[PDB]
Amino acid sequence: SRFKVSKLMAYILAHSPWEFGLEPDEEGFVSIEELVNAVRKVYPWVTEEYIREIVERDEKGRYEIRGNKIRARYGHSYPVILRHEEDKESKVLYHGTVRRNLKGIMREGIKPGKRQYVHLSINYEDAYNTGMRHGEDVVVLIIDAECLRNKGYKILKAGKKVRIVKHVPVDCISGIL
Amino acid sequence: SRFKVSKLMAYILAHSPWEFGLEPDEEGFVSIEELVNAVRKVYPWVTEEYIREIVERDEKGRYEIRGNKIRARYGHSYPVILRHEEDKESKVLYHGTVRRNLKGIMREGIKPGKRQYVHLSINYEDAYNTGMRHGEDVVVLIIDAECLRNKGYKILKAGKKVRIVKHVPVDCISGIL
Ligand SMILES: NC(=O)c1ccc[n+]([C@@H]2O[C@H](COP(=O)([O-])OP(=O)(O)OC[C@H]3O[C@@H](n4cnc5c(N)ncnc54)[C@H](O)[C@@H]3O)[C@@H](O)[C@H]2O)c1
Ligand SMILES: NC(=O)c1ccc[n+]([C@@H]2O[C@H](COP(=O)([O-])OP(=O)(O)OC[C@H]3O[C@@H](n4cnc5c(N)ncnc54)[C@H](O)[C@@H]3O)[C@@H](O)[C@H]2O)c1
Ligand SMILES: [Cl-]
Ligand SMILES: [Cl-]
Ligand SMILES: [Cl-]
């Protein structure tokens, strides 16, 4: 299925490319035919046209093709240089987490942890879906983006609905749902 | 949670699809995006990727995806046409029920009742758990599957653990757990 192939694409591109012999450039980009060969290791119906259709029909916009190079735009577990467009439009953003983290967040703000950035969503639905990775008892913080920027933070457009920012101080959290 | 959304998928696919606007075919298949859109009236965060993940991780293999369509494989409360492969490898199967039904079963054998088929399990554990739906005083009948096949019956692979047979005569009940 496209879903299964996409999961392997995320694994290869965002998490363990070297296991397959790929060498991401400093922005995550690999050659698409190396990627296609690696995916056929597992799913041999896959071709370059199939990879491209997945990229182009992705509602997240989580993949990016440039020439015959391809990457995950965001969410890697390894360091990448993220040179993304600034979001200046959004007034409200959302961060999904589990309730046990509120204690930390309300006194520390939202911190990027082991990533370069904190990940937000322009929709509460997406923030909830992502906050679910850490457990059942999901809460979604409402974030004041104009307040973020006025503190001097820049908000980048990592995906269609994903937004990233170095940090969210408590002052910028305007509700919990 | 995956629990609640799987329960809603079971309700929709196996019990009440019409109330959601879906129109199962003669085999119980609905379009996946129709299903996703139905589930999102209750759990608005649910995506098609989340539903495909549930199908994949279901330890029963109770859902089936065929192309862009999805069904419950067995266990509907409404009548559906069942074209599953024949199980020839299992030698013993299990039927979980409650003690009060023993008087009926030993008089008559195991009867499909409202369903097209009796539902058996590959696994003693799962037979027990399913039997608990009808009360707390559960007994699991050991069924001679080789006997059923020598008697004519065709046993089918409804699920990865579920097997279905039209009727189990008393002569085929090898014991009581
Ligand atoms: N969480 C969201 O709202 C959201 C939005 C869009 C995309 N995503 C995607 O999900 C993945 C990242 O998941 P994630 O956002 O859970 O990050 P993560 O998986 O790296 O986990 C970091 C966790 O730390 C928690 N945390 C942050 N500040 C804290 C503090 N001060 N004290 C205690 N805990 C704190 C966060 O809420 C989060 O649960 C990426 O692929 C990203 O693109 C998440
Ligand atoms: N019974 C099991 O061990 C078992 C195994 C695998 C899956 N399941 C699943 O459980 C769901 C319901 O299955 P079920 O088997 O509980 O059936 P069911 O819920 O449709 O109820 C039928 C009941 O009638 C009882 N019965 C059968 N013959 C009888 C007789 N002659 N006299 C009196 N009572 C009699 C059965 O033991 C059962 O308790 C289905 O989705 C099915 O796939 C059940
Ligand atoms: Cl990922
Ligand atoms: Cl505007
Ligand atoms: Cl059910």
Terminal Cα-to-Cα distance of chain A (whole angstroms): 34
Spatial distance between the Cα atoms of A30 and A27, rounded to a whole number of angstroms:
9
Sheet holding A173-176, edge to edge: A156-157, A162-165, A118-121, A92-98, A138-144, A173-176
Residue of A nearest to B51 (CA): A3
Planar angle of CA B135, B138, B144, nearest 5 degrees: 135
Ligand 5 ion local residues (Cβ < 5 A): B 10, 14, 75
> In order of start, what are the domains of chain A with their CATH numbers?
2-72 (1.10.10.970), 92-176 (3.20.170.30)
Q: Is A159 in the pocket of ligand 1 (CB under 6 A)?
A: no
Neighbours of B103 (CB within 10 A): 9
CA atoms within a 13 Å half-sphere pointing along the CA-CB vector of A44: 1
Spatial distance between the Cα atoms of A125 and A146, rounded to a whole number of angstroms:
21
- Residues in B touching A129 (Cβ below 8 Å): 45-47, 50
Q: Is B75 in the pocket of ligand 2 (CB under 6 A)?
A: yes
Experimental method: X-ray
Among A105, A174, A167, A156, smallest CA distance to A134 is for A105
Q: Indicate the residue type of B2.
A: R
CA–CA min distance A8, chain B (Å): 13
Backbone angles phi, psi at B143, to 5 degrees: -115, 130
- Contact between B123 and B161 under an 8 Å Cβ cutoff? The reply is yes
DSSP state string for B119-152: EEES-HHHHHHHHGGG-SSEEEEEEEHHHHHHTT
- Contact between B96 and B85 under an 8 Å Cβ cutoff? The reply is no
Among A90, A73, A74, smallest CA distance to A149 is for A90
Long-range interactions of A11-20: CB distance < 8 A, separation 24+? A12/A38, A12/A39, A13/A63, A13/A70, A13/A71, A13/A72, A13/A76, A14/A72, A14/A75, A14/A76, A14/A77, A15/A76, A15/A77, A15/A78
Strand runs (DSSP E) across chain A, as ranges?
30-31, 63-66, 69-72, 92-98, 118-121, 138-144, 156-157, 162-165, 173-176
Neighbours of B7 (CB within 10 A): 11
What radius of gyration, in Å, describes the C-alpha atoms of chain A? 17
Q: Would the CA dihedral through A80, A85, A88, A90 be positive or negative? A: negative
- Contact between B166 and B153 under an 8 Å Cβ cutoff? The reply is yes
Among A121, A131, A120, A5, smallest CA distance to A63 is for A5
The DSSP output letter for A20 is: G
Give residues with Cβ within 8 angstroms of A90, minimum separation 6: A122, A145, A155, A163
Among B144, B121, B141, smallest CA distance to B60 is for B121
Tokens of A7: 């999961």
Tokens of A46: 């896959």
Instruction: Indicate the pairing of strand B30-31 with strand B69-72.
Output: antiparallel
Which ranges in chain A belong to alpha helices (H)?
2-10, 32-42, 48-57, 102-108, 124-131, 145-150
Spatial distance between the Cα atoms of A93 and A52, rounded to a whole number of angstroms:
30
Which residue's structure tokens are 């997945």? Answer: A54
Coil, strand or helix at A129 = helix
Backbone angles phi, psi at A130, to 5 degrees: -80, -35
Which of A97, A102, A116, A166 has the most ligand 1 atoms within 8 A of CB, as the residue to mutate? Answer: A97
Spatial distance between the Cα atoms of B176 and A55, rounded to a whole number of angstroms:
56
Terminal Cα-to-Cα distance of chain B (whole angstroms): 34
